[PDB]
Amino acid sequence: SDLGKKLLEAARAGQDDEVRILMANGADVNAQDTQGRTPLHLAAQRGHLEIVEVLLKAGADVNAHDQYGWTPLHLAAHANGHLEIVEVLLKHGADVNAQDWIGVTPFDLAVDDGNEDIAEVLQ
């Protein structure tokens, strides 16, 4: 049906209550959008810490990759930051050395973006 679409929309929009309601109603925790991004991908991209946590606790695939080969760790290391989110991802089994199609690890993204803290935590 459309539960995955609502879950992706809520992960984009940062509604923790709606995310929890949709998961309790049976939304696909690993549903992917047209670009292959899971709700974990979008939540890590937009700095939604609680949604990231609750998706990981609901069984979301931490190592899932989009169509570009980017895991949620890749998206969290890129651009904004929020070192807490990459820490929670790593604690939940995020592949630190995960490579995209051309071999970009999240550490390479952090180094290019100069986020310092993310680079040292990625170790």
């Binding site: 670009q35 890129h78 199609w101 051309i102 290019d112």
Partner: protein, 76 residues
């Protein structure tokens, strides 16, 4: 902002890459060739029907997000 999405297709295999505007396209062509079990020099890579040297980068070709790079076989 610093990255661009591109699609490399050969008419049957399509790959989406999210790569820096300043990264050389050699790695993109290399990945597309490796996934087919071939070397990159065996494949022609065309943007706007014009062949691409490996050393060029998406910024060097004024490319935009969702732009397509066609892939063919050398001596087709």
């Amino acid at each position: 902002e610093t990255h661009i999405n591109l699609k490399v297709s050969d008419g049957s295999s399509e790959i989406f890459f999210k790569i820096k505007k300043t990264t050389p396209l050699r790695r993109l062509m290399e990945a597309f060739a490796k996934r087919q079990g071939k070397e990159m020099d065996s494949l022609r890579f065309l943007y706007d029907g014009i062949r691409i040297q490996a050393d060029q980068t998406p910024e060097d070709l004024d490319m935009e997000d969702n732009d397509i790079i066609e892939a063919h076989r050398e001596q087709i």
